[PDB]
Design a protein around this nucleic acid. Structure first.
Ligand SMILES: [Cl-]
Ligand SMILES: [Cl-]
Ligand SMILES: [Mg+2]
Ligand SMILES: [Mg+2]
Ligand SMILES: [Mg+2]
Ligand SMILES: [Mg+2]
Ligand SMILES: [Mg+2]
Ligand SMILES: [Mg+2]
Ligand SMILES: [Mg+2]
Ligand SMILES: [Mg+2]
Ligand SMILES: [Mg+2]
Ligand SMILES: [Mg+2]
Ligand SMILES: [Mg+2]
Ligand SMILES: [Mg+2]
Ligand SMILES: [Mg+2]
Ligand SMILES: [Mg+2]
Ligand SMILES: [Mg+2]
Ligand SMILES: [Mg+2]
Ligand SMILES: [Mg+2]
Ligand code: NA
Ligand code: NA
Ligand code: NA
Ligand code: NA
Ligand code: NA
Ligand SMILES: [Sr+2]
Ligand SMILES: [Sr+2]
Ligand SMILES: [Sr+2]
Ligand SMILES: [Sr+2]
Ligand SMILES: [Sr+2]
Ligand SMILES: [Sr+2]
Ligand SMILES: [Sr+2]
Ligand SMILES: [Sr+2]
Ligand SMILES: [Sr+2]
Ligand SMILES: [Sr+2]
Ligand SMILES: [Sr+2]
Ligand SMILES: [Sr+2]
Ligand SMILES: [Sr+2]
Ligand SMILES: [Sr+2]
Ligand SMILES: [Sr+2]
Ligand SMILES: [Sr+2]
Ligand SMILES: [Sr+2]
Ligand SMILES: [Sr+2]
Ligand SMILES: [Sr+2]
Ligand SMILES: [Sr+2]
Ligand SMILES: [Sr+2]
Ligand SMILES: [Sr+2]
Ligand SMILES: [Sr+2]
Ligand SMILES: [Sr+2]
Ligand SMILES: [Sr+2]
Ligand SMILES: [Sr+2]
Ligand SMILES: [Sr+2]
Ligand SMILES: [Sr+2]
Ligand SMILES: [Sr+2]
Ligand SMILES: [Sr+2]
Ligand SMILES: [Sr+2]
Ligand SMILES: [Sr+2]
Lengths: 73, 46, 237, 56
RNA sequence: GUCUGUUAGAGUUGGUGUCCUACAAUACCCUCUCGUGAUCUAUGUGUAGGGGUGAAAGGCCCAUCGAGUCCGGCAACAGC
RNA sequence: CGGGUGAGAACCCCGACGGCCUAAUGGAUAAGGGUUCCUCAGCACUGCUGAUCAGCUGAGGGUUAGCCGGUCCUAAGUCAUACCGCAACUCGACUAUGACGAAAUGGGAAACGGGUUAAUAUUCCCGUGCCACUAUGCAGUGAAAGUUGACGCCCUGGGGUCGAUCACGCUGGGCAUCGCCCAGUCGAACCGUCCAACUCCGUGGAAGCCGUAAUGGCAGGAAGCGGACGAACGGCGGCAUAGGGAAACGUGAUUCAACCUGGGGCCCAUGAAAAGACGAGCAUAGUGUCCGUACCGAGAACCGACACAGGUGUCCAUGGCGGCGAAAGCCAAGGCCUGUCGGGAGCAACCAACGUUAGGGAAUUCGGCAAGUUAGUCCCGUACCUUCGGAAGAAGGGAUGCCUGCUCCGGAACGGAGCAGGUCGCAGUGACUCGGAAGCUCGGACUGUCUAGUAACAACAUAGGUGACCGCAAAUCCGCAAGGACUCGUACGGUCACUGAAUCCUGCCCAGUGCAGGUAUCUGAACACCUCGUACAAGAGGACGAAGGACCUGUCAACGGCGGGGGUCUUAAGGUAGCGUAGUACCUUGCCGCAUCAGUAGCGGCUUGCAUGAAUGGAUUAACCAGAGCUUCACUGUCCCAACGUUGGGCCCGGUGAACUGUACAUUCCAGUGCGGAGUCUGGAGACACCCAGGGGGAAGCAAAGACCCUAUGGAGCUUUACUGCAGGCUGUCGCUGAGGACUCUCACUCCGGGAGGAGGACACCGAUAGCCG
């Protein structure tokens, strides 16, 4: 997480990078199969360690709040 | 540096041009190469 | 005085140009003879330098391989389609007319055939609202009600990379790296920190603009700086 | 670093060279233009009335 | 865009040291700062004078800059 | 110190002894130079002295390529032609085409080893090998899908060569109380062959096992077993009764640059293109042209006027000891005594750069400036504060060598961690290398930037905060135009500005100014229209009335403002939370306190603030800092107060050999005088001439037609509601421009579309003119 920043940058900034980076690196469930083996491969790019599936999605998380609206609409 | 065939002909000429005035010309003219040059003290074109 | 920076910009020198020779591809919609019948397969996902957002590489039936303005949710192997008879699913492209009201769209054309102009940035999206035989009302990311020709093509879904803005740059160095990929001169020196000869707000023993910051819209380039034709300023009121 | 002597040491770039058209060492090999006769820029020979006094 | 570091390399706080018809029209020595990054660097390439370029010092654009250099206007004008 | 050559020798050469250089003072090269390279003969010139020497002079000579570069390819980008613009071009943007653009250091068909010369050398020669094209013959009908060229940053595993080291053997050398020490022990390209990793297939059947340095893997089929594909500049065989060596002409090992092949992590950052190659056999033969090739590459061959202590790219980063080390120090290979004047004097004064100083210990000084103190490593231990990361190597304390014999970790190291006993010194990181520490306050959050050449900071930047403009036929900006940047961009964008991390917050004011919206009425130009005038025209007046203004409204994280009087007045409001004698407080060394023998300092408090105050941001703040101030401990020649010593100068001698400065005269001194600041005038005094050394009192010393100040109907940069104008924007009108105060239409014209056609439309664009802003 943010520990790599030491005492530089301050609370707010170090905190948000942590939040963002933790959700960012959680085990995410692959949409093709159902296994939570998704690791980010770059900005907005996600891939499944299991099925090899490669998807587009949020920058720091595979599904944006409004990315989910589309399914419904 | 690398010299082209032409640059070589020129440098070549500048070398020959850098000679003594024939001993005999000084007699014929009853008593200097004003274009005499030195590699270090002077600077050729190009 | 000397021309201000915004004037050096126009001359379009290297310092102010975008690294085009490093950019991948305009993501304008593919053109279809007609009757749709155009589908392709997503062969790979790539990073778009010019937009800090992912983009999809598609292989169409007729053997044409092109990068596409990818919405969120496109994955390798998936099948996309472009045409009127296109199935109303995320990643497909069809005239605003064939799109059901209430559906989120992106990369919307301004004029049928231009290949898309609106809603192409990360996570953004236009909401299609009204239909008709003459006009299709779309709500653009700025919240503006846009009246478009129902023949204007669009993609269903929101653009990939949402929330890119949620995370702070934290350090100048990070900013630096992104800037190095856009047509932008960075960092920024406040005009008020310049000599009078370099900018309207320059000079003075202590830094402070020597005039009100709200400039008229008819102000000439070189003088038009600060808050341009502002309708108001501040937060109060 | 001073602008004088220190900065002269960095000068080993070749620009002006013998010009195929006039023979002067004025052909800028990076610009490919003779600052003397204007070879590579003008089919006409580089002339200017200021190269001499106005009434001469 | 972490730390120590004369690794390479980049720089220069103090000595108001040495030098100041110099080794040098910006040099020498010790101390000092940076040294995985907004880093340093070679070559190539682009931007040109009321114009560039400038993390802005009116800084830099070949020892030249609050408007480069060359020649021309020109034998400028001055009540000094 | 000897000797050689020579007319002549400190510095040209030989030997011995003595030294210097180790990322360079060694090796190879790029740029640049251009013959500086080799030989002979010279010394008038050049050379910090001399010269027989030489980068100097004279005369000759020297650079050899199918396989090393160029050449070929394309990069940012450049030009030429066409098109269009421009009064015009040698000028100008776009779009087409073509070409150009990489010599160390992007891509790329092919060469190694040895020998040879005074000077060349993968080029000549010897041996061996390889590539391309073509021809012929055989084979082959496959031939273009695909692979390659072709790629970022960080961590890391495995394969593995050179090197280095260890063991033992062989050859040679050295030393001589010992028995150690040194060198060598060789051998390429190429041809063949082996294959780890990755990937995959068969078998198998794990429901907790497999695997790693780490992550990880699996019934969507783990381990195990077999198999396909498959690496090195690497191993092995040939090459090689080639070559090289006086000789021997090794074998094993460890650690392993190169090279090869994997695994992991990161991105608001995504890490070239093209030619070409493979895909696609073998023989034999022929062809392989053109250009570069010397030398230097630097404290003398480059740039800096110089044989300049400066500047100047690449690689040799694995030679030995040392140690963490590409550190110091010492030493090899290799190079050098040319960072090129010498000779004398215990060699004075004085200066540079140093060593050592008793007692005192910052008393010195603006200031501990300068110097010093501390120091490596291990163990113990470590405060306030804090954004919980840090602070922290806090502080403080202890240990440290050698020798003998061992233990533990590991496969092992010539790796690491410890134990017991012995023992020397004043001192064991013994040299070298190698932090002094602590507290308070101010500032900027931090890394970062800057005045090339007096400023490194508190200034600029920054992330973060905020406001503004714009839906893309946009906003902003460049161009006279043709056109263009932004833009392979589209509001999670990008333009224009302010503030400047985080934390707590950010009050009141729209009167003036600015911007914006609105507007009955008022005002508001030109064209057209009407009236008067004129046989016409000039002209006078009228009607209409765009933007603009008057008027109204909105807006201060717009410009800015938040006082004086009394218990409101100006000019809208009348200073809220904070903070406060401030980097802002004149008075001022404010008053009280702390600290000192004594404190215009510093800190804390008070605070009426001459003249603090909230994004002209306020307060506050951990971390950071060659930033400003203060205090303490430690230490010391900073000082009391100076001394002695070291090296280089200084002084004497040979040689070389300038410059600054010069109206004249000139041995001055004390007084006076004088345009009031005299070696030169007056009156006295003193004064024999010349030379050496010295520190600089005077010559209002020398240096630069004072930069301060004033003056000139001088100059320039900058400002603005100075004067006058010019671009630019907005707006009306005429032309383009057409049909049926308001409307429909299509046919010019505009934009979108490959096209059909679609959207718009007499508007807009463009040309002209007028009003406003400027
Ligand atoms: Cl950004
Ligand atoms: Cl691994
Ligand atoms: Mg932001
Ligand atoms: Mg700024
Ligand atoms: Mg300034
Ligand atoms: Mg200034
Ligand atoms: Mg200005
Ligand atoms: Mg400020
Ligand atoms: Mg300000
Ligand atoms: Mg040679
Ligand atoms: Mg020398
Ligand atoms: Mg005193
Ligand atoms: Mg063991
Ligand atoms: Mg203070
Ligand atoms: Mg700072
Ligand atoms: Mg300076
Ligand atoms: Mg900001
Ligand atoms: Mg406020
Ligand atoms: Mg003036
Ligand atoms: Na020369
Ligand atoms: Na000498
Ligand atoms: Na070593
Ligand atoms: Na106001
Ligand atoms: Na000026
Ligand atoms: Sr020179
Ligand atoms: Sr487009
Ligand atoms: Sr297009
Ligand atoms: Sr100002
Ligand atoms: Sr407010
Ligand atoms: Sr250079
Ligand atoms: Sr030309
Ligand atoms: Sr002419
Ligand atoms: Sr660092
Ligand atoms: Sr100083
Ligand atoms: Sr010193
Ligand atoms: Sr100086
Ligand atoms: Sr450091
Ligand atoms: Sr003149
Ligand atoms: Sr002589
Ligand atoms: Sr020589
Ligand atoms: Sr070429
Ligand atoms: Sr190359
Ligand atoms: Sr690198
Ligand atoms: Sr290894
Ligand atoms: Sr050579
Ligand atoms: Sr040098
Ligand atoms: Sr040696
Ligand atoms: Sr000499
Ligand atoms: Sr002693
Ligand atoms: Sr003191
Ligand atoms: Sr004192
Ligand atoms: Sr200690
Ligand atoms: Sr600088
Ligand atoms: Sr803040
Ligand atoms: Sr107002
Ligand atoms: Sr003297």
């Amino acid at each position: 997480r943010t520990g790599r920043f030491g005492p530089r940058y301050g609370l707010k900034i170090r905190v948000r990078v942590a939040d963002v980076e933790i959700k960012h690196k959680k085990k995410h469930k692959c949409p093709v199969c159902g296994f939570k083996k998704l690791k980010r491969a770059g900005t907005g790019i996600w891939m499944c360690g299991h099925c090899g599936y490669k998807i587009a999605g949020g920058c720091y998380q595979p599904e944006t709040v409004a990315g989910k609206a589309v399914m419904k609409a | 540096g690398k010299k082209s065939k032409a640059t070589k002909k020129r440098l070549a000429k500048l070398d020959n041009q850098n000679s003594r005035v024939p001993a005999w010309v000084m007699l014929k003219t009853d008593e200097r190469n004003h274009k005499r040059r030195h590699w270090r003290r002077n600077d050729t074109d190009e | 005085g000397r021309r201000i920076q915004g004037q050096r910009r126009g001359r379009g020198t290297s310092t102010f140009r975008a690294p085009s020779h490093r950019y991948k591809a305009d993501l304008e919609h593919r053109k279809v003879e007609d009757g749709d019948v155009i589908a392709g397969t997503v062969v790979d996902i790539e990073h778009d330098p010019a937009r800090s957002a992912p983009v999809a590489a598609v292989e169409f039936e007729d053997g044409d391989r092109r990068l596409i303005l990818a919405p969120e949710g496109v994955g390798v192997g998936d099948e996309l389609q472009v045409g009127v008879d296109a199935e109303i699913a995320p990643g497909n492209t069809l005239p605003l007319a064939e799109i059901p009201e209430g559906v989120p769209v992106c990369n919307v054309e301004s004029s049928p055939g231009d290949g898309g102009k609106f809603a192409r940035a990360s996570g953004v999206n236009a909401q299609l609202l009204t239909h008709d035989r003459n006009v299709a009302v779309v709500k653009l990311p700025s919240g503006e009600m846009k009246r478009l020709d129902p023949q204007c093509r669009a993609t269903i879904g929101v653009v990939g990379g949402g929330g890119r803005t949620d995370k702070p740059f934290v350090k100048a160095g990070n900013k630096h790296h992104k800037m190095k990929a856009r047509g932008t001169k960075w960092p920024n020196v406040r005009g008020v920190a310049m000599n009078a000869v370099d900018h309207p707000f320059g000079g003075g023993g202590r830094q402070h603009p020597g005039k009100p910051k709200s400039i008229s819209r008819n102000a000439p380039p070189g003088r038009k700086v600060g808050d341009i034709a502002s309708k108001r300023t501040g937060r109060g009121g | 670093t001073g602008a004088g002597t220190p900065s002269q040491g960095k000068k080993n770039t070749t620009t002006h060279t013998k010009c195929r058209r006039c023979g002067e060492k004025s052909y800028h090999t990076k610009k490919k233009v003779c600052s003397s006769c204007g070879f590579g820029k003008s089919a006409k020979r580089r002339d200017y009335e200021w190269q001499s006094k106005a009434g001469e």
